[PDB]
């Protein structure tokens, strides 16, 4: 009755960050050690809780958010951050209690690519918001009637993932673990 963290991290394919995937984890025993002393990861940033008590704390729900971004943007997956990814694709709340785990995925997601990110939005996203609109972005007062043109752009943009790129441009796979505690019985706990 372990929780299926492997299906998330060891997933064959990952989603684009504008359409980030979320897996809800509940009614299970979570052994975080099979996940956390792998040194495979490049960044392991936690906010408000330490993994060294995770195997031995309890939460109502756990959320695993999966996507792919660039190196320059992994720093934006954090509370109180600003930038294209943090403002238009995936936003963490300032009171975020969780972990952001990112690792280089040049071998798997870089070809001599299919991932996209939102480039245009009139207002920043609220925390844990997911925008999968493909509606033409209206940069002027004239409506666009659904075709690209002057003052009307496609809101999404393709990543240029090539293996020869610098480390900053390489694709990184990112998993965000959020720990949900409310006024309800806890359903995810550690071996303890």
């Amino acid at each position, epitope marked *: 009755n372990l929780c299926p963290f492997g299906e998330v991290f060891n997933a064959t394919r990952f989603a684009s960050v504008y359409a980030w995937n979320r897996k809800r984890i509940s009614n299970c025993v979570a052994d975080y050690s099979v996940l956390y002393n792998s040194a495979s990861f*490049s960044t392991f*940033k*936690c*906010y*408000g809780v*330490s*993994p060294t008590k995770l195997n031995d704390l309890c939460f109502t729900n756990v959320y695993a958010d999966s996507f792919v971004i660039r190196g320059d943007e992994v720093r934006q997956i954090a509370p109180g951050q600003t930038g294209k990814i943090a403002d238009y694709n995936y936003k963490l709340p300032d009171d975020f209690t969780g*972990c952001v785990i990112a690792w280089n995925s040049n071998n798997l997601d870089s070809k001599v690519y299919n991932y996209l990110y939102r480039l245009f939005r009139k207002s920043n996203l609220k925390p844990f918001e997911r925008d999968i609109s493909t509606e033409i972005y209206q940069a002027g007062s004239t409506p666009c009637n659904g075709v690209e043109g002057f003052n009307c752009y496609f809101p999404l943009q393709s990543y240029g993932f090539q293996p020869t790129n610098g480390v900053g441009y390489q694709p990184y796979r990112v998993v965000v673990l959020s720990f949900e505690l409310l006024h309800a019985p806890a359903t995810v706990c550690g071996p303890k």
Partner: antibody
Amino acid sequence: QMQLVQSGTEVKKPGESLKISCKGSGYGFIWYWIGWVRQMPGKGLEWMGIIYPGDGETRYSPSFQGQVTISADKSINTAYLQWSSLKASDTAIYYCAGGGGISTPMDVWGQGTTVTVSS
Amino acid sequence: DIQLTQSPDSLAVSLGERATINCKSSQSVLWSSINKNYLAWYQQKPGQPPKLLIYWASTPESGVPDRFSGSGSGTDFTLTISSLQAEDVAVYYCQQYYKTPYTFGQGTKVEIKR
């Protein structure tokens, strides 16, 4: 459990430059944020700042913001505390500590580095 | 810049008696999403680095003997050593880690009363 070790004792003259080391060893240094603590002789602990070695994110106390510098080299799992011009004021013991994330307590502590700055 | 003031500065307790150290916060350090106060208690014996005794204001760290207990919430917190022993002579600090920058208390010296 994770283990920190710091550099040796320093004795310097005023105006000299100084850089002290704190090297981390153990299971999961990857998620550890490293903080710096000053303790002047006979005084309490003062929090100086914190760094994440994985990407170099640094936060400073307003009291220490502009006249120390906190650096890190992830390749050797080491954090660094540096002054460019020491004063006699800076005579103290400097502790490197580690907690498993931001807004977490400091589980791991180094043995401390004693710094004496005198003419 | 959350400030913490502990009282008293000095404390004299006899072997086997009770030691109480209060720590008052300038602002509240309760993380309402997780419902846990982000307060910690450290012990520093003479000539040695500080040791983490209690985190989340009441959860003892692994290996800490049962005579240490943490209490409080909002702005008022207390560290209690029941049945004080000679090896418990140290300076005790309360530290807040709700927000950066982290801040420490002025220190509480604990000696044995005889």
